[PDB]
Amino acid sequence: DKAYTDAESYTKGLHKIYSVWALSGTALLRCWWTLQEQPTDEMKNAWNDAWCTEVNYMTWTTNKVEPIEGVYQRCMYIVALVNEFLKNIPNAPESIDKESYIAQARFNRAFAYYVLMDMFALPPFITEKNYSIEPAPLSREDLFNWIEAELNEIKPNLPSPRSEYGVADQAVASALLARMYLNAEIYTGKARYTECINACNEVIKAGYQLADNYADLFKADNGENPDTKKEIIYPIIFDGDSWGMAAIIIGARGAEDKDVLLAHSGVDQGWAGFRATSNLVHLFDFQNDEEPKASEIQDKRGIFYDKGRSIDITSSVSGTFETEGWSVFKFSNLNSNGQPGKNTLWVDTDFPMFRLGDIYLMYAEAVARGGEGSKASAVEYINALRKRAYGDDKHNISENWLEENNFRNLLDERGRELYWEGIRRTDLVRFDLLTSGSYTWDFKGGINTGVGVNKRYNVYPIPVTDLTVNGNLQQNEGY
Ligand SMILES: [Mg+2]
């Protein structure tokens, strides 16, 4: 698209690569987030589009589904850009730090392949070294192995942790490895819980801290507030001075008066799409658990708007945004001082792709499942999260809690801590509860009370779009 020539062009080329996550151009962050939340127990979408039902229910086929196309095209676009960048970078002028730029381009490509591996399993494998009109996929395990070797090799050449908010630093590479290793039994058939713990410790030792205020993690000024910057390892950056994060926020608001929307959210518009299931609400403690009300919640992590809404989605998932399912206002374009962000549409709120709260929970789960690490520390990390949640010391857990009921307390706690941060689908797959009939939620499988679905649905199908033009590429099993 833009040829490489002077120093500026190489710096702008790297920035274009990083920018694909935030870019509309639909948007990678939105598509990815949708695909990680909408088929789960965390979110159901009230839009009437045929794709929404399919994704809501997990009844999709190989018929084209717009967010599936989005995630796939945009990830492979990142890979394309990085490959062209790496091909040009040896000709860079002397003023460019080639070693740093190569390490960072490679991080972006590794992350794009991570998302593809987790979501599609078997993408085409195309690097700057194996150019082909019709590239073949690796096995999922081989792709994992390649991504891991990319991240291990580049890590000592990446910037030091926190040296620039938004840049893929050494700790960002370790956070991605932690997330890969936690899930390695899914991707590779072999568990890597010790390696998960090792990557978590690399992050923990870099001096990150939990934000004092949980809610501010997801407000307009999360990227500028020092309290929340202590915790955010890797953000997808947004600023009012692209519709990706705007769509996630606005999508979760209803058709209310502009002023009431601005009052409570810092936005003009509410598209009446994304909202909660009963399962998400019931994960949190309330003053009266038999009759939950958003204003009586005890675990303050749950940030809900309940006016006029039932807890359950019962009659229909579409057309019922205003009446069935609580709204989720976790991501907000009000700043931490209550003021609106500087634009009513183009939000300031950053997406926290990796943050220390997740690292804590990963460390605890990896130790629970038998990795080499400390149960005492695991308990300390979960209790830090729960003290923040409840504002007191009366909701601590103990070591037995980590292992009991087949690690389900950890799945529940990742729900309470990390809901709507784009990780729920991966976590459900790890517990093999995404597709199973043993754990159901509102409209799972297309039945209101919920049913299991076939195990093919643990991954999305590769676009027929790409299968038509690439003869070496194969569809995922079962589709
Ligand atoms: Mg921002």
Whether residue 354 is annotated as binding a ligand: the answer is: no
Distance between CA atoms of residues 441 and 280, nearest Å: 9
The CATH architecture annotation of domain 161-253+330-419 reads Alpha Horseshoe (1.25)
The residue behind tokens 């309940």 is 306
Q: Does domain 254-329 have CATH number 1.10.3780.10?
A: yes
Ligand 1 midpoint to CA 215 (Å)? 15
Decide: 23 and 242 in contact? Cβ < 8 Å: yes
DSSP-assigned letter for residue 183:
T
Distance between CA atoms of residues 32 and 86, nearest Å: 26
Question: 3-state DSSP call for residue 235?
Answer: strand
Question: 3-state DSSP call for residue 180?
Answer: helix
Six-digit token string for 27: 């948007």
Decide: 205 and 318 in contact? Cβ < 8 Å: no
Buried b (16+ CB within 10 A) or exposed e, 231-247: bbbbbbbbbbebbbbbb
Nearest to 42 by CA among 275, 250, 249, 299: 275
Question: 3-state DSSP call for residue 330?
Answer: coil
Distance between CA atoms of residues 57 and 44, nearest Å: 9
Domain map (residue ranges) of the chain: 1-160+420-479, 161-253+330-419, 254-329
Ligand 1 midpoint to CA 132 (Å)? 39
- Measured over the CA atoms of residue 203, residue 209, residue 215 and residue 218, the dihedral's sign is negative
Whether residue 348 is annotated as binding a ligand: the answer is: yes
Ligand 1 midpoint to CA 348 (Å)? 4
Ligand 1 midpoint to CA 345 (Å)? 13
Nearby residues of 459 by Cβ (< 8 Å), 6 or more positions away = 119, 120, 121, 476
1-160+420-479, what's its fold? 1.25.40
Distance between CA atoms of residues 50 and 65, nearest Å: 9
Decide: 90 and 5 in contact? Cβ < 8 Å: no
Decide: 325 and 44 in contact? Cβ < 8 Å: yes
Q: Do domains 161-253+330-419 and 254-329 have the same CATH topology?
A: no
Experimentally determined by: X-ray
Nearest to 180 by CA among 15, 323, 366: 366
Distance between CA atoms of residues 34 and 119, nearest Å: 12
Whether residue 224 is annotated as binding a ligand: the answer is: yes
Ligand 1 midpoint to CA 337 (Å)? 15
Distance between CA atoms of residues 83 and 353, nearest Å: 23
Distance between CA atoms of residues 444 and 118, nearest Å: 21
Radius of gyration over alpha carbons of the chain, in Å?
Answer: 22
- Measured over the CA atoms of residue 361, residue 327, residue 451 and residue 440, the dihedral's sign is positive
Ligand 1 midpoint to CA 34 (Å)? 21
